[PDB]
């Protein structure tokens with residue numbers, strides 16, 4: 130089986146930028162008829178994927194002159210000479226020279242902007258959930274940049290790696306930042322077995338984690 | 349005008365069966381190769397199967413045996429019989445028209461969503477997320493809303509019926525355990541709340557659910 134490897138999984142760019150996205154095949158991808166069936170697709174948010182390039186270098190009719198494909202052997206490249214706002218989305222490479230046909234993981238074309246430390250907010254269980262016998266400790270790390278971030282929970286001083294559900298938003302269309310939610314889900318009794326609940330955020334901006342917490346009995 | 353419209357997608361219990369359909373237009377199946385490609389929740393693209401202008405059929409070993417592609421050349425309808433369905437088979441399915449020995453997936457349909465799950469329609473638990481006394485000592489304040497354990501997706505969450513639009517972040521739903529859980533956060537000035545009313549409005553069409561939760565300051 131021929132596997133396609135894409136890099137990077139996220140390419141932050143400034144509009145006007147000339148960019149190059151790469152794709153690596155586990156081995157040579159030349160069909161027995163001599164053609165290389167390497168295709169490039171762009172999927173715009175909310176839409177289905179669209180063809181850009183076929184057979185390595187052929188630009189699909191109707192596709193802007195700023196897109197172009199190249200490569201040989203196991204190395205392939207998609208080029209965009211001058212990035213526009215419309216080009217933002219995820220690009221996928223694909224090989225159909227050998228079966229099974231294989232897709233690359235995709236590379237997200239995202240926008241660059243100034244670094245942004247996240248605003249961290251921690252929320253103790255609501256009395257209604259408690260009343261229903263549940264206890265969810267939510268934490269929001271909002272509007273940060275770059276998207277890379279680590280969240281750590283500490284219950285009564287000790288780290289809690291188990292039972293954490295995290296979700297991330299796509300880059301904001303207005304401020305180009307990113308946000309994430311982390312929810313520690315416990316039981317009413319489990320939650321009442323401790324007093325301190327802490328949410329720590331490690332962003333390339335703070336190093337020493339942004340720390341937020343509360344005590345089940347005081348504030 | 350080439351057109352591809354997928355139908356049949358829907359909820360299906362594991363091991364269950366489902367037939368997807370794709371009505372084509374603007375071309376003939378005798379002149380083009382057709383395929384099915386799916387996009388998983390993770391946004392990963394996967395080739396499901398294809399049938400050439402001449403009838404030849406191809407499948408990856410993962411789909412081989414479980415899925416069956418066929419076509420009605422006369423009515424110009426492509427089909428995908430799905431069986432032995434697992435949660436990993438949960439994805440958006442697209443039929444695609446390609447050019448023989450030229451381009452595999454030249455034109456994609458918008459797709460039909462297939463969701464494999466044992467879960468049953470469950471209304472969501474909507475909880476108001478008020479700040480801890482420590483976070484409320486600034487010029488702005490972040491409030492939240494927890495929409496827990498619902499099925500299926502989606503739910504519709506707004507703030508003040510949509511009145512409250514900016515400074516909001518409604519996070520993608522995740523599976524808590526065959527059930528979905530989502531949360532939204534809204535950030536406003538300290539003078540906006542609790543000084544002014546802020547309610548989380550969550551609807552869940554599948555269960556005819558429409559609940560409202562007002563975020564009240566904590567404390568006795």
Ligand SMILES: CN1c2ccccc2C(C#N)(C(=O)NCCC(=O)O)c2ccccc21
Nearest residue numbers: 381382398399400446447448449450451452
């Ligand atoms: C679209 N298309 C396609 C679609 C469905 C099924 C097969 C193909 C195909 C392959 N292999 C192709 O053109 N097959 C012709 C049948 C044959 O091998 O003689 C092929 C080869 C290269 C590029 C595209 C395609």
